[PDB]
Amino acid sequence: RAKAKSRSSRAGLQFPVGRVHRLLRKGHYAERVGAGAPVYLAAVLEYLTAEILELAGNAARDNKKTRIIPRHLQLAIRNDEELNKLLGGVTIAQGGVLPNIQAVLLPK
Amino acid sequence: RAKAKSRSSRAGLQFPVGRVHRLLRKGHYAERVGAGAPVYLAAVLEYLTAEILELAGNAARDNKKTRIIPRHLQLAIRNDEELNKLLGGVTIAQGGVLPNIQAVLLPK
Amino acid sequence: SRKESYSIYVYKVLKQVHPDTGISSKAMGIMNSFVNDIFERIAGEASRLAHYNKRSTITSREIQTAVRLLLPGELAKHAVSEGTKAVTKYTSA
Amino acid sequence: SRKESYSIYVYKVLKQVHPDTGISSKAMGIMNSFVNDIFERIAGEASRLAHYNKRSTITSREIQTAVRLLLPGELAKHAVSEGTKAVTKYTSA
Amino acid sequence: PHRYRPGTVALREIRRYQKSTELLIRKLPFQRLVREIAQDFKTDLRFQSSAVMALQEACEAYLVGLFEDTNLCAIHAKRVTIMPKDIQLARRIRGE
Amino acid sequence: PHRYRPGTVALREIRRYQKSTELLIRKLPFQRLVREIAQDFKTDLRFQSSAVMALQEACEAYLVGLFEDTNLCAIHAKRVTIMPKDIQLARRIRGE
Amino acid sequence: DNIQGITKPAIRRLARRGGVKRISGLIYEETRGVLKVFLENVIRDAVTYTEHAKRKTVTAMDVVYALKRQGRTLYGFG
Amino acid sequence: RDNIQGITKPAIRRLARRGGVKRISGLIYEETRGVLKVFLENVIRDAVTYTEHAKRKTVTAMDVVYALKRQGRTLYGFGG
DNA sequence: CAGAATCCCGGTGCCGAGGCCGCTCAATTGGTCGTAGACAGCTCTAGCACCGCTTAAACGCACGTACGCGCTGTCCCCCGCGTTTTAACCGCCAAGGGGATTACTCCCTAGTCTCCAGGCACGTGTCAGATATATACATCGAT
DNA sequence: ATCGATGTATATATCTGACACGTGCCTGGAGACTAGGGAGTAATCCCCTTGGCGGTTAAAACGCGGGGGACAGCGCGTACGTGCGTTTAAGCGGTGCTAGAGCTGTCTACGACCAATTGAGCGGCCTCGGCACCGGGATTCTG
Structure with a gap:
């Protein structure tokens, strides 16, 4: 009985491969689930999380803040052409709108 | 051993209760399927099938034809305010369009 | 191989609805697609x-609620009566 | 009773991205719902x-194809690259 | 006396409300409306405190987008005043 | 000689094509366009006889729907002639 | 008749967030009807989910599911 | 290549006539060609993706039906 | 109000829809048995109701200017008709790449048992953000 | 060229409750082994996709005459925006009640899994009448 070590440590990931494997089996998506599916899905979810957090953290500094809030997430998503396409139908509470005024309305 | 009698004949339906129960088991929708589910679903599918075929047949009769063709199915669906709502995102091959002209375009 | 269909x-x-009327092969293909659409x-x-x-079993109550959520008001109103009548007669047999 | 979330x-x-910044509980809730959505x-x-x-099992080929269908052109290339890197590191450990 | 010209305060309000994120409808009058509508479906219903907040957030997010669409179809006609027919056209093209 | 006034024939064409059901784009040119676009994704592809017909039916339905939306945008400006900005407005409101 | 609780100033504030500079006098009564029609379609679904569970208290998740079914995913309320 | 020019002016007019358009500006043709090309590209990318997952070399009608279904438009009469 | 366009009627004729036969594999009847969920009782969270107070926001009025609308003019770009030409459509003949199926066998995943450490409630405390005050300096409208 | 009256923002000090961290412990992930059927490989059949020729009329390309539509300019009159004084009721802080959401325990009615039997419905074949095409006549509608 060797000392147990997590699959995430073997793969080099922060997200939980075991929990993802459990959630796949409990969803009835198929009768069998292969060994590589949870490692691939965990890596994908970690990537998209890090990209969102990086843009939100940059938006926080531009406002001299030190804590991320929903407004920074909204500004991070709506200012990126790739993230805005993926999350076009999603509504974020307390996010507000982007500043925009049509040129026809400004003074002559 | 008693002589077999089909479940559809017991319920009085035309659609196959056995095939519906088989499809419910093979699709992995859930791990258990109650005995009442397929009779209810078969009765609903039969109702909607007859509801469409009646209007299609009336359209075929108005055109003075005897065989129903896709044009009659399009005319049936698009003239009913409830069928058109359920089937709004559906395009039917060889269905064409309903005659309509904007009043502003007609001559004085 | 053998292919199943609802054509019959x-x-x-x-x-039953129009004894004198007939149907072309293309209309049958459309009807055969419409049935699988609503089933899914x-x-x-x-x-x-x-x-x-957190239930493990599908029952007639799940079908009745799904029917009330998917179909418009009058269609749902009639379809629920049809399903209830069918299940009642099946159980009484 | 005991809940379960990805906040850790x-x-x-x-x-790792920003070792000097923190996150509010309201933002953490949105980040928690985002992962559940994309997972589903x-x-x-x-x-x-x-x-x-007509296969009985889910494999990395299904995950890779789903990613290529769902994610945009630039996100897809990077996501696929590191997914394959992770699988290779796991299988070579 | 002192008086600003028509339209400068409107632009200053636009710049104001696009920067903030608070809710703009009164909470208690909206809650009474939600209570009144639900009564047509079932009697003696109860509502969690967060359900009304979810409904209010969804309604305001919907109305802001509808006004954004209506303004473009007002400008297209070379006008600046929005009118009912602009809302009707936006809703018809949106399919709702 | 006898000559019809401008627009008399256009209404007759509208009635004719709304009452008919056949496809309107030439089959061979469309088939070559489909085989040309696909070559960017994978080489030496082959196509079934029914896949091209499915694509043609989908494209013609899409274009007819877009023209139906564009005509409402033209009338809103009190014009009769459709112009590119009407297409751009319809596509912007549809969110394409 | 609580629809009158959606006052003219509130509608103007919503129009300002949307960038509208000048507003016609008939927009208010059109907007009230639009909102009244929108609310009913969400409440009917929320109540349907509440009744299926045999509960008597409408819950935030019922509203979240009602909105998601219409394509209006809301992030923040679990 | 020149194959985009195969969508001639008369074909565009016939399509506009079915939609009820009475008078057409001379600049609509190039705009319509640009609108059509992006639609074809989007549908064909998905169809080829399904074809490649199956390891086939022929593109079948089902790949097209599934692609359209994913874009949010359903086609009746070809299968499924 | 002459005449160009659409509809309809009588005759020909063919290949698509309606019906029959063979037959095999999917549905029915009968039996066992394990656990999912229906019912009864209890705890205690949080949804509903009432009161008093301050003052933020909504309401009603006046006034004046900037916008929406209708009319006129003119000029140029769409429509309708005719001639020429080019490449779409039909029908017939070849051949071979690739889809669909069968037979074999091996290696991948599901299942049971043990056991032990990852991460979930709970408690604490200190500093990031909210607020009041003062004031800097930017903009808009009239002279 | 600019003044000067309003407005938005910034800089300093004080406060408070939201966030980050540590502790106890329990239930869910990891290690080790066995059994069996899903997927991988190789070989065969044959069908339907790609390639070519001949030829005839349906459809596209090119010109041109003219008229009716899009666009700019002008006048006018009343709908909306800005600012003030009044009054309505939203927001908040506190206390109390009890309806009903969430949980544990018992047990019995339901659905899954096997085996033997046979008939429902799918594939191949026949055929005849619904539809479509040709030509000539009747009616409508427009310039």
């Missing part, structure tokens, strides 16, 4: 309704 | 791909 059942219904929509919502309540 | 892993990632989208499409081919 659609024809039996047509013969109802089975999908019945499955979601089961997981949200 | 999200915080671990945050301290990918697992859904992978199940459909398996059903169309």
